[PDB]
Amino acid sequence: PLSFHVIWIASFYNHSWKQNLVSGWLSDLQTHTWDSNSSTIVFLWPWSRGNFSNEEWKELETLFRIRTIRSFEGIRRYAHELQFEYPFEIQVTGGCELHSGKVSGSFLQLAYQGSDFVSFQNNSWLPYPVAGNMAKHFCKVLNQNQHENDITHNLLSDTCPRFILGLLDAGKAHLQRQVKPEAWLSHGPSPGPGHLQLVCHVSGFYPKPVWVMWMRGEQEQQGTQRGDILPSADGTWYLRATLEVAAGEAADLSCRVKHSSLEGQDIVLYWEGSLVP
Amino acid sequence: GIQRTPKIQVYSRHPAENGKSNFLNCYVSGFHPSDIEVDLLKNGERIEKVEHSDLSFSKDWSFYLLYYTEFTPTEKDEYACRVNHVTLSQPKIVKWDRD
């Protein structure tokens, strides 16, 4: 549903040239970024500060700054202490869930080389059984320092629920906004003989849930193949739904788009014109 | 061996219309590791000043990147996206689909 999580990417291409990224996300929308130049939290939106005070944000900066330096620099010896093979990548994500209203439902996971490696379960780092012994060896390291785990537990149990509560409220105007879609038709890669591919693009709509279907009058053409919902530079989404029919039965077909922003006035485009032609 | 290969999708923000500015998007997703080096191409040559989104990964730990640029189409212009991953024996080019 609605989840606020903070991601962490650590890429190690060789013994030199290590990469590090930290980002915050409202489950599809990036809201925070970490500036390694000055060790500060960059706010992508004015409402991304939530209901947290300015002083409260400074302590979060020092927490993330100190955590990052100690964590991201201690990897380098571990790759040599262990048998890590460059290149390797460490990914971490942690946050909390908006169940029904909000609150309970926090999480924190770590992945080595793109596979589930370890996870933090309410006071302790539990390895994934399929991850093998190396996860257990690094769970031993992570579970040693109690003070860090107490901070981590408080971060997932108190700060996250209290932050997403104010973050959603302060960002209500941006999230509840409705943007009408824009649609057009085109020709597709043209499958085997006697068959045409009809493409119906839908672009620039927010929120995400959309309805698109090729129609012949009121009859929905169930051969409609709906693709992936792709993003854009703005918070809008793009989607094209295709349909393959015989050449002689192309006319009378129409693409129909339903969206909450349209207020029930569906977009209908007809396969007529230079398309037929 | 457990490295994943990217999914490349190219699309325009608005219908193609010569002389009218538009946005070309190339969505590179579902790949691992991060070193990816995607290029947007106009008539074969590379396009400079191409913006892209911050790196992120989906739930299955595979990364996704969005590369976009502003452009104005013409009749003779061709556009494509060039991706070069470790899982590619040669760069994979996905062409923008016009009529």
Epitope: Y13, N14, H15, S16, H80 | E37, V86, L88, P91
Partner: T-cell receptor, first 109, second 114 residues
Framework: KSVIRQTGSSAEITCDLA??????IHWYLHQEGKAPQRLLY??????????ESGISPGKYDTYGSTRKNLRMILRNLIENDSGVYYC???????????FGSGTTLVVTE | AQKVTQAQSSVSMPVRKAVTLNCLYE???????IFWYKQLPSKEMIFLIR?????QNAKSGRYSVNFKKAAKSVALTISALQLEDSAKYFC????????????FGKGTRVTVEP
């Protein structure tokens, strides 16, 4: 330029590399009939040593001012440590990596 | 991961002629460089020429290369052989995007017949 040591002693070679350059200075080992291979590099921005894949953490160490007086100490020498040791750093443009003067190490029982 | 090999070790060719030193590499990188270094008998390494992953055949002075990228074969050809050029020549490759180290070949000694 040439150093002689007995098995078990120590040897501190010097790096006479041209002026200051990019932060990382790598140490390579060249032996007769074998391909040169880097052993480690020195991070001047952190004044710390990072090793390569399969080197014991006590054998090599690096320190000093990287401007023409970077040192590299080898301890607990064995016979197979003999060879020419170079120090290398990349250009500012990363076009080529400069190599300093070699230092021949001879270890005998 | 990466391997660089030079098959032969000793090569001789008369002065005022041309000889070619070959180099074979096995890499898994789409962006890399190829370097040739001249090792003097005084134990000193000197850069000679650089060849890029998607660069045309490099050329500088009396140096030229024959880049067969399909089979991963780069050969250094030294034209107008002089007497000072007699040394031991090495080929190595490094990461173009993240330059860390060089994987060297085992060497190819060239002596010039006067």
């Amino acid at each position: 330029k040439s150093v002689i040591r007995q098995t078990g002693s120590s040897a501190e070679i010097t790096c006479d590399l041209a002026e200051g350059s990019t932060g990382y200075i790598h140490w390579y080992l060249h032996q007769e009939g074998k391909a040169p291979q880097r052993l480690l590099y020195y991070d001047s921005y952190t004044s710390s040593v990072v090793l390569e894949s399969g080197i014991s953490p006590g054998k090599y160490d690096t320190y000093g001012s990287t401007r023409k007086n970077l040192r590299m100490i080898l301890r607990n020498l064995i016979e197979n440590d003999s060879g020419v040791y170079y120090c290398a750093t990349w250009d500012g443009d990363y076009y080529k990596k400069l190599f300093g003067s070699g230092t021949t190490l001879v270890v005998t029982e | 991961a990466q391997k660089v090999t030079q098959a032969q070790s000793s090569v001789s060719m008369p002065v005022r002629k041309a000889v070619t030193l070959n180099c074979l590499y096995e890499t898994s990188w789409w962006s890399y460089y190829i370097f040739w270094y001249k090792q003097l008998p005084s134990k000193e390494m000197i850069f000679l020429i650089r060849q890029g992953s998607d660069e045309q055949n490099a050329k500088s002075g009396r140096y030229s290369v024959n880049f067969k990228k399909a089979a991963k074969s780069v050969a250094l050809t030294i034209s107008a052989l002089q007497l000072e050029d007699s040394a031991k020549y090495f080929c190595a490759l490094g990461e173009l995007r993240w330059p860390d180290k060089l994987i060297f070949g085992k060497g190819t000694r060239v002596t010039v017949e006067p």
